[PDB]
Amino acid sequence: VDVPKDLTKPVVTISDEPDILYKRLSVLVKGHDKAVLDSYEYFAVLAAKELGISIKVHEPPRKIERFTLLQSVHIYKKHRVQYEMRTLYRCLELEHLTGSTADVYLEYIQRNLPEGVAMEVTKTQLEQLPEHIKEPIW
């Protein structure tokens, strides 16, 4: 029975300047756990379909960095211990976005990025030839 009668919505004004067009948006997420990346893909792909964005998913080959260390504090060289770090990837290649659309979507997924998961967003912007490049200055 106790519910807000009216709600206030954040102001989103429409500017006069043009918007930035992104031909492709590539999101690469790293992690040590594959289940957190499979669970993050579901949220990112479902958020895109609800926003109307084309998205493709593939999984780049993982990398395993290894290194060895002496087992004992002193002597006993032949006995060592090996450690590794596993990095698993997941690329989400969105297409045909705009600056505003990418801005909110990236903020939404970036904020909810789980602990132990990095991100590399590569943005391919569409531009037009500069005025000077149109004709030579004879």
Binding site: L69, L70, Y83, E84, R86
Partner: protein, 101 residues
């Protein structure tokens, strides 16, 4: 409150190497060329050799930050193999696990 005096000496070394970094760079630039006269390069060879020994970066030693161990140090974590394993064997280093293949 550093581990030992050996660590304390390096701390000073690293502090004096940061103050003379630019001065030494500008003087070496003259020496590292075949353009300027030898007369000027010979004067720069005496100027960079008169600076304090602790400004030289070849005296800096990458010791451990917890036990000041000079050898057996991992540069990415600045820890000795003994301190690295201790934290890695207890699951305190994100991503670090034992390798089996």
């Amino acid at each position: 409150h550093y581990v030992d005096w050996r660590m304390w000496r390096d701390v000073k070394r690293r502090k004096m190497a940061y103050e003379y970094a630019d001065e030494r760079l500008r003087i070496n630039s003259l020496r590292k060329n075949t353009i300027l006269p030898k007369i000027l390069q010979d004067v720069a060879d005496e100027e960079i050799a008169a600076l304090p020994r602790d400004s030289c970066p070849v005296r800096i030693r990458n010791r451990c930050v917890m036990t000041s161990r000079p050898r057996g140090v991992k540069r990415r974590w600045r820890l000795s193999r003994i301190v690295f394993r201790h934290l890695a064997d207890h699951g305190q280093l994100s991503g670090i696990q034992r390798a089996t293949w």
